[PDB]
Symmetry: C3
Subunit: 239 residues, 3 copies
């Protein structure tokens, strides 16, 4: 029993994302034209994409019930699948990467390559959750998704940092890269521990809360820190 546990994890972020959007409009309204202003735009779009994700889940548009396959801890049982989360990450995670790439001033060759890997990660993660014929294919898609994640992590952890040191944004970039790497690693852990994976935690409402908490930090806190710094150091960024 937990329709309320599940629904509260969703409404709470519709409220938080909405508040973040207002706060960010306030914070960036006077930012100078150019690169600084572009990052402000990305910072606004991260919570807007997040609200779309939560509305898809609350409305029922992007949620369905799926039956787990033989071998799964819940084999032959119906599980609620919030596939709308996995689908929407294909738009919000590239926006986070866009914000970070604009900040580090990376060449779009690198930005395009990282967003491509990131989309591969999200598409294969969705496939992992939607696959029901055999347990093997669910984990095979999860593994491929991890492989795409490594490509993204390698870029944060290395190439992109090179670009930041040269744009005069190494310090803020180091803070945001570490926060991103740490929080992003939490999504596949939640997936593997919850109903979709090993089912060590069998509550979909609990797992939904785990993702909602990760979102608050990976998206809203992330974006506030980034936007506050850019507003306070706009000459460096336009430069």
């Amino acid at each position: 029993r937990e329709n309320a546990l599940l629904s509260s994890s969703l409404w709470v972020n519709v409220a938080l994302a909405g508040i973040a959007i207002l706060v960010f409009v306030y914070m960036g309204r006077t930012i100078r034209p150019g690169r600084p202003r572009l990052i402000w735009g990305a910072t606004l779009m991260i919570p807007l994409v997040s609200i779309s994700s939560y509305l898809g889940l609350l409305s029922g548009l992007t949620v369905g019930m799926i039956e787990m396959p033989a071998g799964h801890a819940l084999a032959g049982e119906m599980v609620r699948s919030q596939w709308g989360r996995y689908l929407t990450w294909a738009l919000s995670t590239p926006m986070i990467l866009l914000a970070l790439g604009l900040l580090a001033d990376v060449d779009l060759g690198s930005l395009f390559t990282v967003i491509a890997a990131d989309i591969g990660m999200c598409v294969t993660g969705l496939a992992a959750a939607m696959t029901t014929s055999a347990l093997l294919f669910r984990w095979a898609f999860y593994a491929i998704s991890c492989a795409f994640f490594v490509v993204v992590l390698s870029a944060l952890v290395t190439d992109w940092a090179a670009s930041a040191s040269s744009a005069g944004t190494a310090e803020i970039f180091d803070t945001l890269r570490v926060l991103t790497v740490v929080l992003w690693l939490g999504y596949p852990i939640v997936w593997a521990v919850g109903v979709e994976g090993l089912a060590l935690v069998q509550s979909v409402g609990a797992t939904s809360w785990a993702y909602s908490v990760l979102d608050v930090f990976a998206k809203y806190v992330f974006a506030f820190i980034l936007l506050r710094w850019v507003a306070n150091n706009e000459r460096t960024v336009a430069v």
Copy 2:
């Protein structure tokens, strides 16, 4: 009664888009290599994406019947939903923005950010039309879509214009930006007045004609004006 009213609004643009494509091949065949030639390519792709959209609708591939929720003027009634229009805009509107960004010579940081917002606009607009559980979620998605539209409009209306003045294309860019802003504003008005929204107009054939007319100007006339100017001023653009 209006299978004919609806079907004619679709075939008419398959014919017009097809004619535009032939005219554009004729107009741009001799354009010099580089930036001018890239814009010619985008100008060809706008009507090609448009024809795909109309074929999805005419074939039935991207059309379904949906039932309106409690509170809607047509609550508990089946309505034809041309969701293929909303879906295909996710590919054609970025092409229009690409053509305008190549023209204004914007940095791809800005172009990527604007196309990202534009895709958010189109995806949330589709969600608005496909949502059926509650009337509230339909309008919530419509509002978020409007928010993404504002980000795109802000770019036309400001940042991009800066880039154009510096590329030597301010005049043609001012003409095309104004035409785009005006015509693009007509799509959410049609959506809100027609069956999907307030249903002040309850004919799906009429609303389909409203969109078809907007397409002729937003896509075909838009592209002809752009292509004619680039063919006539290719030195400025390659420069």
Copy 3:
């Protein structure tokens, strides 16, 4: 009878793609930071996207049975449709184009325009295979797809080559462009000769083998040649 013929064409490439990935990690581990390293990343992602495609097909996630329309050689018969192939090309073909564009050092204006056309090609090809109301619309989508393909071919065949000569990569680019043009032309031929098109070949297992063979060369051999050359000429590429 041929569940085995069909399934072997899929498992064989899961194995080959997996081997390619290991070989490429080995080959590119020491490549210098920058452009060379980005191409290595794309070279890794081509086979990773390919494995996702084959897992979607083997699991049943991206396969369905469709009934052919009046006038088709198999009118009123159920045909297995591997639509997951067509869908996944929307991610793998842009990666191939990305690798080639990084190699030729093209401006992202051109790269974005070519990937846009390429996605149009893949989306309309999928529509061609998924359309079932009338035979006419299947071929109309196939023709539009061909039109988008011409835009991509024009870029390989011309604009991109200009960029390569200027990056010091003309020779390797000429080899890879020719291999790409030739192998890519084989996909629409297979589509038109097999069950989806004219049905001159009515075995879905045979047609699946035709695509699998094209994939080995268009993706794995392609990527090995590209990666071997970049590892051996990294100074030219970083330069």
